[PDB]
Amino acid sequence: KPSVLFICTQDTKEEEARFTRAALEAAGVEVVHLDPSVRRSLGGAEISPEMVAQAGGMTIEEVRALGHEGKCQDAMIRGAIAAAHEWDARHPVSGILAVGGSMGSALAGALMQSFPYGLPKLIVSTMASGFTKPYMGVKDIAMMNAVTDISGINTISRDVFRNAANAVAGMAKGYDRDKGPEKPLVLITTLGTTETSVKRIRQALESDGCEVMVFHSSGAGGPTLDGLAADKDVALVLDLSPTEILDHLFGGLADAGPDRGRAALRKGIPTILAPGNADFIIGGPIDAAEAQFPGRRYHQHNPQLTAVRTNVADLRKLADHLAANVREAKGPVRVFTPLKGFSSHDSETGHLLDLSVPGPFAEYLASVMPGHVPVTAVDAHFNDEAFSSAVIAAAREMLAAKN
Amino acid sequence: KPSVLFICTQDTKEEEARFTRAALEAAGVEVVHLDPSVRRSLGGAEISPEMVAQAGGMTIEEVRALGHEGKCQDAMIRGAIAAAHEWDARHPVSGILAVGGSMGSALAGALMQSFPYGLPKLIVSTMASGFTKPYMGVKDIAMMNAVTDISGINTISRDVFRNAANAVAGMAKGYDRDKGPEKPLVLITTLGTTETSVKRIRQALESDGCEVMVFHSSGAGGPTLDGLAADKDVALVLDLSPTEILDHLFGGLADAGPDRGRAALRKGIPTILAPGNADFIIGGPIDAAEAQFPGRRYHQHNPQLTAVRTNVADLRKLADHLAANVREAKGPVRVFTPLKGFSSHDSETGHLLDLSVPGPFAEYLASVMPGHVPVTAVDAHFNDEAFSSAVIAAAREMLAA
Ligand SMILES: COc1cc(C(C)=O)ccc1O
Ligand SMILES: COc1cc(C(C)=O)ccc1O
Ligand code: NA
Ligand code: NA
Ligand code: NA
């Protein structure tokens, strides 16, 4: 029998998970239930909430002690993705089914984007608003809504759950993981403010036959890349947005701890580094951000998040940290850095342009990197075709290397 | 074996269509391929493009010569829906799978919205924008997207098509159309400018246990309601937006011919009429709309569509036509009309407001409707809670009768 990874929190409405798991089993698959609940642990799940938390580096006690709703969701996203790949590496699944509200669907979307293209993936959403919007697109994720007003406002339809179980079971029984052409797996980090070049890079390498995954470097994406680099078969890492490292260095909101970006280097995966988004630290709401980082220029991204302009002194600490990471690398590394700005905020159309910073940064980064890691300073903005073209050419050389 | 209705244009996706059909067959279903192609008519489709066109009342050559995105789409939607329900009438399907771009996905969505809640439904879209947006919400339609750039930009993936076929076959093999309680079926017409009250009406009757289908009355929706009313077990029709009748009278863009709105009445289904959106005729872009409909007032709804303000005389013609239709009714009919405006364009925060029209229109409408059909003039706007509540109360009485 094929195995389906089933993602569903039991702390709310435990009958949804019970019903859907029974419908999967009745349709002829085995179930591995991953339960990322924070409020209560009901039992009956292969991957318990406690296991989920710890896979991400926190005990559930520590997760429950977070006083920040965003950081708490990030911890369970990080844990769920870590636990799912740690499991799949040893016991491969043939499909992923998720049932959740706004937060649970968002967690499932991120997790599903980190599994291979073509693996069956289905989210059953239970919020009245639209489907979740996974980062940079739905990709191959199938979506169904279970909310109906028939028989009562905001009924959660068991007919949808039954249809979803029968669908995923059908897909899983038809799925042949070791089929089709093998596609080298390329992992990329980005923020919205570096998507222009990241999209060009993605499209070029996919055109070559690679499978490219793109992760949002806002607190959980970088850790997803790091987990894949350690536990799955990755051909190339393009760690182009070190937001989570820079925020770690200065107390920003994307802090994901000190080991961000080290895994690929320790595994010896060919890696390209770039300083996308190094023009800002991510602070909180404007009044808090200004209080935490006085005397700077700010851009209010949304009500919760403020881009805080960096300076040369800030980026020398980033350079030092990246150089130390690279000195631990067990495989090849290249570094590319743009001379005319790091993101769309740091641009002629943005609110944080400061052209005095890229030059000194590039010169210092080259001085601290070891001799076997060349730094290429590109006379372009990050989002210029000249910069994506330079990264693409380098990626293609690293992917052409023979065993 | 159960059957799956498979919607896919072969004139642009022939390889994908044959692959996906084969995958459905391998997974143990029979396939009914409905092919709404507009360029070519390739072999193997149960419901050919020619049938899609003619089931709606046009030859495929006539559809091709429209040259016009909206008129072509409306023709193929009307035809695809008529042909699909005609097939299903005698040979019932157990699921619907569609594979298409922007237009094919939208046609599939409209067709799926005219089939019962819970019947397996999956749209695989092939446009880069992602999923299509079915009118007033996805409800029970499942969505996938097959675009990928791997091995070539704007590829569409065999892995996704195979997953989609396996999914719908699995759902169809597990589907029991007789499971659960019967839901009384209620059909409603609307435009975006009457959605505020229609949403309340839908929610109240769904919460009573009804299945409610809602149709956009822009050229294909009304005809879908009429087809269902003629041929299916319908508990109640709320024909609250006679746009397609008004545009037939004046040559507007939602014209769907002379029989719009008659089927439910001729059959005898309990029906409520209202004059939602009677503040405007639908014209084309503003310059052409002014030339077609001179001497009026206009509101540019989007670059393609202009709302052309109606006047007293126009609405007396509409009332005459509605009354003629009602005199043919074989079952209960009631009428509700709002005294403070017919749509969100005809409101204090709308660009077509004319509060001098609803009062005299309501008087005239009552005078030409037969006396056994009540005509209630509500001292509210169409989209006010008082108006939806009046319609809901009458709907409940008519369902209980
Ligand atoms: C959290 O993700 C983002 C934050 C910013 C800021 C804070 O400007 C920009 C782009 C992003 O994708
Ligand atoms: C074609 O559908 C619509 C047209 C209008 C106009 C022409 O104002 C308003 C709402 C609609 O849902
Ligand atoms: Na949940
Ligand atoms: Na549950
Ligand atoms: Na939930």
Short mmCIF file of C-alpha atoms in Angstrom, two decimals, chain A residues 117-122 131 138-153 157 159-160 162-164 166-168 170-171 173-175 179 181 183 202-204 206-212, chain B residues 117-122 130-131 138-153 156-157 159-160 162-164 166-168 170-171 173-175 179 183 202-203 206-212:
data_model
loop_
_atom_site.label_atom_id
_atom_site.label_comp_id
_atom_site.label_asym_id
_atom_site.label_seq_id
_atom_site.Cartn_x
_atom_site.Cartn_y
_atom_site.Cartn_z
CA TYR A 117 7.01 18.45 -8.48
CA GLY A 118 4.51 15.85 -9.47
CA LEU A 119 4.03 14.25 -6.08
CA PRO A 120 0.28 14.34 -5.38
CA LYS A 121 -0.57 17.33 -3.15
CA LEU A 122 -4.05 18.47 -2.05
CA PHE A 131 -7.73 29.50 -0.89
CA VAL A 138 0.20 27.35 -6.49
CA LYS A 139 2.63 25.23 -8.55
CA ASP A 140 1.24 21.64 -8.65
CA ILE A 141 -0.83 21.92 -5.43
CA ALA A 142 -4.50 20.95 -5.84
CA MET A 143 -7.01 22.86 -3.72
CA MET A 144 -10.56 22.19 -2.51
CA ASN A 145 -12.82 24.26 -0.25
CA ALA A 146 -15.00 22.48 2.31
CA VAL A 147 -16.99 25.45 3.59
CA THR A 148 -20.67 25.42 2.66
CA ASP A 149 -23.76 27.13 4.01
CA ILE A 150 -25.97 24.17 3.11
CA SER A 151 -27.64 22.85 6.33
CA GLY A 152 -26.15 25.71 8.32
CA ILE A 153 -23.82 28.68 7.95
CA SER A 157 -18.61 19.46 4.41
CA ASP A 159 -18.77 15.21 1.28
CA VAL A 160 -15.76 17.35 0.38
CA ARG A 162 -14.64 12.10 1.35
CA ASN A 163 -14.02 13.36 -2.18
CA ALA A 164 -10.60 14.68 -1.14
CA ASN A 166 -10.71 9.40 -2.59
CA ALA A 167 -8.85 11.84 -4.86
CA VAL A 168 -5.52 11.69 -3.00
CA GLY A 170 -6.37 7.58 -6.34
CA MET A 171 -3.40 9.84 -7.07
CA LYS A 173 -1.93 4.60 -5.98
CA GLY A 174 -1.09 5.90 -9.44
CA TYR A 175 2.10 7.66 -8.53
CA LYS A 179 9.62 7.33 -12.92
CA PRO A 181 13.54 11.79 -16.01
CA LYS A 183 15.79 16.46 -12.63
CA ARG A 202 14.48 29.97 -12.07
CA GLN A 203 13.16 30.00 -15.61
CA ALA A 204 16.62 29.51 -17.14
CA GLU A 206 14.09 24.90 -15.34
CA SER A 207 14.41 25.33 -19.11
CA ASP A 208 17.63 23.28 -18.82
CA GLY A 209 15.71 20.49 -17.12
CA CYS A 210 16.27 21.34 -13.50
CA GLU A 211 13.62 21.35 -10.80
CA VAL A 212 13.83 24.69 -8.97
CA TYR B 117 -23.10 20.09 -5.03
CA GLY B 118 -20.76 17.26 -4.14
CA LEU B 119 -20.50 15.72 -7.60
CA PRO B 120 -16.75 15.42 -8.14
CA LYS B 121 -15.46 18.46 -10.03
CA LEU B 122 -11.85 19.31 -10.93
CA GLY B 130 -3.20 30.31 -11.74
CA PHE B 131 -6.81 29.28 -11.12
CA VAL B 138 -15.27 28.18 -5.91
CA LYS B 139 -17.76 26.32 -3.67
CA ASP B 140 -17.14 22.59 -4.34
CA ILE B 141 -14.94 22.87 -7.47
CA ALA B 142 -11.43 21.49 -7.00
CA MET B 143 -8.54 23.29 -8.72
CA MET B 144 -5.14 22.40 -10.12
CA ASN B 145 -2.70 24.22 -12.39
CA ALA B 146 -0.54 22.33 -14.93
CA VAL B 147 1.83 25.07 -16.06
CA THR B 148 5.52 24.36 -15.53
CA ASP B 149 8.76 25.67 -16.96
CA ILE B 150 10.73 22.44 -16.45
CA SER B 151 12.42 21.35 -19.73
CA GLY B 152 10.80 24.33 -21.48
CA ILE B 153 8.98 27.54 -20.59
CA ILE B 156 2.04 21.83 -19.29
CA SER B 157 2.91 18.79 -17.28
CA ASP B 159 2.49 14.51 -14.21
CA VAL B 160 -0.28 16.95 -13.33
CA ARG B 162 -2.08 12.06 -14.80
CA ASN B 163 -2.63 13.09 -11.17
CA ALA B 164 -5.82 14.94 -12.23
CA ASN B 166 -6.35 9.58 -11.21
CA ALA B 167 -7.98 12.00 -8.73
CA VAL B 168 -11.26 12.39 -10.63
CA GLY B 170 -10.96 7.92 -7.68
CA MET B 171 -13.63 10.41 -6.73
CA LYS B 173 -15.60 5.47 -8.32
CA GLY B 174 -16.40 6.49 -4.74
CA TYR B 175 -19.36 8.75 -5.50
CA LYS B 179 -26.22 9.51 -0.35
CA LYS B 183 -31.74 19.17 -0.94
CA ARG B 202 -28.61 32.24 -0.93
CA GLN B 203 -27.28 31.98 2.60
CA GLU B 206 -28.90 27.14 2.05
CA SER B 207 -29.06 27.25 5.86
CA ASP B 208 -32.62 25.83 5.63
CA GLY B 209 -31.16 22.86 3.75
CA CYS B 210 -31.65 23.99 0.14
CA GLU B 211 -29.11 23.66 -2.62
CA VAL B 212 -28.87 27.07 -4.30
#
